[PDB]
Each structure stands twice: as structure tokens, then as C-alpha cells.
């Protein structure tokens, strides 16, 4: 199994980042994709990717930080992407559920990073919340020039899922599906996701699975909870956890071009 959603730069892991990484590996996790959310966090993720074996990173600007985008920013992401630890351009995309950055500059910073991925021939680590239609319009002229793409932390509908998959977009599934409150719609579309478009992640330190027993006092998510998520996903697909692990790991290698 592989975790494509680890925000390891987070200050929540500051006290025990080594132990966090080590424990995940001791649970069956075969690799980590350390998420970069802005220029500064992308540079830190590249440093952590050298620090640990079987760890890579993404370089990009989150739609939440899309207001930070300048002309000096592009080349800065490229100096970082040149590293053999950086395998994806992201996290980038649209987030209209919030207002942290104006949708004008969200869109601008999204297309800019999409152009970068086309220039360097790299896959993208995408983010989309309540912005599906505007998402596919901006992706439309760029996607055919990219190796691949992933809609990580997908929370949309099954129609939206089939809309993305039709264009070769990998669907990322977190422990959001483990929430009884607001994970009903997701769990029912899970068997419809083509197994070779499925990717598993934790989005640590967020989206700690609610069906965990017992619950950690801290309630901080970590990549050591990935096997739990795969098992639930496999069960809700009527699959063997070992089989889906071998498939989801192939998808990681196919999309990112890494080995573990």
C-alpha cells in the first residue's frame, strides 16, 4: 500500500516526525507522497523526501495559497521539480467551498501550474471542492499534454467521478469514507471507481477515520492509519485488501513513475 496524501511538513508532526514515518512503515505502508501546499511548504517537503526512504514530494501552490502567486514563483517550483524527489506538480486546483483566495487568483494559479506540468511533462496533484464544472473547463486544454493526473481527496458525486475517470484522472480516496456522518455518498460510489484509477491516502494530519477503535486521544491523523482505510475500502468494494493494495500501488507507480 502507498499513501499519496501526507502533509508531513505540518507542525503537528514536529515533535515526532521520525517516529510518525517509522511507524507507518512498520504498519505495512510502502511509501509516502509528501504534500507541498505552497512554495515554502513545497521546499520543506523536498527536504523531508531526502530525509526518509521511499518518500517523494509534490511542488505547487494550494488554491488556498493561490494569492501568493507571482512571476518569480513559477521558476521557483521548477528549480524544485528538477529534484528526483519531486514527482508531481501540486497541490493545485479549485476550492470554492471557501473564500480564502479569490476564485480569480485560484484559477490563475491553477492554469499557471497546469502550464508548468505541461512544460516539464509532469503529472498533477489536484484539489477540487464545490468547483467541479469550473475544474474540468480549465483542465480541458491542458490535460492532454500531461502524463497523468490525480484528483486527491475526492468528495464529489458518482457522476462527477465517472466524469473525471473518463479523462484518465485518478480518484484519491481518504478516511472521509470512514465517516458515518458525511461519508455515505462516497462509500456507495466506491465500487464504481475503476480499480486502476483508485488511489488511497490519509490526508494527514486531517480526516482521522471516525470508525477507528479505540480513538487516539490526540485525534491527529497519520499515515500509520492507512491500512485501516484500505481494509474498509476493500470491504466496501468486495475485494481482498492484499489484491487492492497490489493494484493501488501499481497506480502510484504508473502515475508518478516511482518504485517501492
From Swiss-Prot:
InterPro entries recorded: DNase_TatD-rel_CS (IPR018228), Exonuc_TatD (IPR024918), Metal_Hydrolase (IPR032466), TatD-like (IPR001130), TatD-type_Hydrolase (IPR050891)
UniProt keyword Metal-binding, yes or no: yes
Keyword vocabulary terms for this entry: Cytoplasm, Exonuclease, Hydrolase, Magnesium, Manganese, Metal-binding, Nuclease
Transmembrane segments: none
PROSITE patterns in the cross-refs: TATD_2 (PS01090), TATD_3 (PS01091)
Consequence recorded when altering residue 91 to A: Lack of nuclease activity
GO biological process: response to hydrogen peroxide
Cofactor binding summary note: No activity in the presence of Ca(2+) or Zn(2+).
Binding site for a divalent metal cation: 91, 127, 152
Recorded phenotype for the gene knockout or disruption: Knockout cells are less resistant to the DNA damaging agent H(2)O(2).
A GO molecular-function descriptor: 3'-5'-RNA exonuclease activity
Gene Ontology cellular-component terms listed: cytoplasm; cytosol
Up-regulation conditions: Constitutively expressed.
Cellular compartment(s): Cytoplasm
EC number: 3.1.11.-, 3.1.13.-
Cofactor entry: Mg(2+); Mn(2+)
Task performed by this protein: 3'-5' exonuclease that prefers single-stranded DNA and RNA. May play a role in the H(2)O(2)-induced DNA damage repair.
Alphabetical list of PANTHER family matching this protein: DEOXYRIBONUCLEASE TATDN1 (PTHR10060:SF15), TATD FAMILY DEOXYRIBONUCLEASE (PTHR10060)
Similarity-based family: Belongs to the metallo-dependent hydrolases superfamily. TatD-type hydrolase family. TatD subfamily.
UniProt xrefs under NCBIfam families: PRK10425.1 (NF007745)
Subunit structure: Monomer.
Protein name: 3'-5' ssDNA/RNA exonuclease TatD
Lineage of the organism: Bacteria, Pseudomonadati, Pseudomonadota, Gammaproteobacteria, Enterobacterales
Underlying gene: tatD
Amino acid at each position: 500500500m502507498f499513501d499519496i496524501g501526507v502533509n508531513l511538513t505540518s507542525s503537528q508532526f514536529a515533535k515526532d516526525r521520525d517516529d510518525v514515518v517509522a511507524c507507518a512503515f512498520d504498519a505495512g505502508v510502502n511509501g509516502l507522497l509528501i504534500t507541498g501546499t505552497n512554495l515554502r511548504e513545497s521546499q520543506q517537503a523536498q527536504k523531508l523526501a531526502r530525509q526518509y526512504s521511499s518518500c517523494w514530494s509534490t511542488a505547487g501552490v494550494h488554491p488556498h495559497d493561490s494569492s501568493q502567486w507571482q512571476a518569480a514563483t513559477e521558476e521557483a517550483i521548477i528549480e524544485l521539480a528538477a529534484q528526483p524527489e519531486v514527482v508531481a506538480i501540486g497541490e493545485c486546483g479549485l476550492d470554492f467551498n471557501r473564500n480564502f483566495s479569490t476564485p480569480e487568483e485560484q484559477e490563475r494559479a491553477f492554469v499557471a501550474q497546469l502550464r508548468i506540468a505541461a512544460d516539464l511533462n509532469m503529472p498533477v496533484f489536484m484539489h477540487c471542492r464545490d468547483a467541479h464544472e469550473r475544474f474540468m473547463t480549465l483542465l480541458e486544454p491542458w490535460l492532454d499534454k500531461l502524463p497523468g493526473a490525480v484528483l486527491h481527496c475526492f468528495t464529489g458525486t458518482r457522476e462527477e467521478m465517472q466524469a473525471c475517470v473518463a479523462h484518465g484522472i485518478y480518484i484519491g480516496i481518504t478516511g472521509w469514507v470512514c465517516d458515518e456522518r458525511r461519508g455515505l455518498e462516497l462509500r456507495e460510489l466506491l465500487p464504481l471507481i475503476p480499480a486502476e484509477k483508485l488511489l488511497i491516502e490519509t490526508d494527514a494530519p486531517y480526516l482521522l477515520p471516525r470508525d477507528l477503535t479505540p480513538k487516539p486521544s490526540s485525534r491527529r491523523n497519520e499515515p500509520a492509519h492507512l491500512p485501516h482505510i484500505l481494509q474498509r475500502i476493500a470491504h466496501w468494494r468486495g475485494e481482498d485488501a492484499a489484491w487492492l493494495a497490489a493494484t493501488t500501488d501499481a497506480n502510484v507507480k504508473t502515475l508518478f513513475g516511482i518504485a517501492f
